[PDB]
């Protein structure tokens, strides 16, 4: 309607914002008329005196979404701040969230290649990805939160997603498998494995085998020797059998330099383990 666009040209800034909200409800049907008047809505978003800037940005972002220009739609959706709710089950919000995660993962991947150019990630884009990861964690969809955390290169949210999961050993085994199949970079794979070793040590029943396998991928014989020494000094016969099982499983992987370095760092059971 050219009546709402005419109301945006009037000096009553609040009434212009009301016309913009009227075009928002109607953005799905009236986007072809509103697209001709984008420069007027952009000028209302740039105007510092306007208290309803986020609503102008939200109308602009919806118009760019219907135009198919998702990058500009995302830039204006980031401008809308609190009016862009991640809780809304709208096709507009889903497509922009998917695009926001993809752009965020792309920028994080590039920022890790260029050790010399800190690509300035918009803090608003990070805050949307945070809220989405928190939503996935609240929904009990830990596997999805872990996938997104790995793509986003965010180790802290990966630790949060694992520690909240009802099935800690299943989530960790999934993380190990995903880290081997999808993480093409060695440096980042080692950082994920170092985080997994820290998470495994916080658990009440540490799976010492999965820890020793992760430590073997990290080439850290010091940590394995300390775990074997702790298990050997335990009074329980079960912890001693577990130490021997770990020793057999380490030998099955045939990394001779690692096995010799583990052996030489070990300060009747000790003779059996050395054998």
């Amino acid at each position: 309607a050219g009546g709402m666009l005419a109301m945006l040209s009037e000096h009553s800034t609040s009434l212009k914002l009301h016309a913009l909200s009227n075009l928002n409800v109607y953005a799905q049907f009236l986007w072809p008329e509103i697209s001709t008047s984008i420069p007027l809505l952009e000028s209302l978003y740039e105007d510092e005196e306007f208290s309803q800037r986020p609503l102008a940005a939200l109308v602009v972002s919806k118009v760019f979404y219907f135009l198919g220009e998702l990058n500009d739609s995302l830039a204006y959706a980031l401008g809308a701040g609190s009016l862009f709710d991640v809780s809304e089950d709208s096709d507009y919000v889903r497509t922009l969230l998917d695009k926001a995660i993809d752009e965020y993962a792309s920028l994080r991947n590039k920022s890790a290649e260029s050790k010399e150019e800190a690509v300035n990630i918009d803090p608003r884009l990070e805050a949307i990805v945070e809220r989405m990861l928190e939503k996935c964690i609240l929904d009990g969809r830990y596997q999805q939160a872990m996938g997104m955390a790995i793509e986003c290169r965010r180790l802290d949210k990966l630790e949060e997603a694992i520690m909240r999961s009802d099935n800690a050993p299943g989530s960790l085994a999934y993380c190990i498998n995903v880290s081997h199949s999808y993480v093409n970079r060695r440096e980042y794979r080692q950082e994920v494995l170092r985080l997994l070793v820290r998470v495994y040590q916080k658990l009440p029943s540490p799976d010492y085998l999965s820890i020793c396998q992760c430590l073997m991928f990290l080439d850290q014989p010091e940590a394995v020797a300390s775990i074997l020494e702790k298990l050997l000094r335990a009074e329980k016969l079960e912890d001693t059998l577990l130490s021997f099982q770990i020793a057999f499983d380490l030998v099955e992987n045939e990394h001779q330099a690692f096995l010799l370095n583990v052996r030489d760092r070990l300060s009747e059971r000790l003779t059996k383990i050395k054998g």
């Binding site: 969809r141 596997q143 999805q144 872990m146 996938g147 999934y174 498998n177 995903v178 199949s181 999808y182």
Partner: peptide, 30 residues
């Protein structure tokens, strides 16, 4: 597991992607 279907699908798609250069090489060598 739920995220596995997407990760595996991406792995296979990426693997098939190199097939473009693979075929292009033979299209000229042939």
């Amino acid at each position: 597991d739920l995220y596995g279907r997407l990760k595996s699908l991406e792995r296979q798609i990426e693997f098939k992607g190199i097939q473009e250069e693979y075929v292009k090489d033979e299209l000229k060598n042939l």
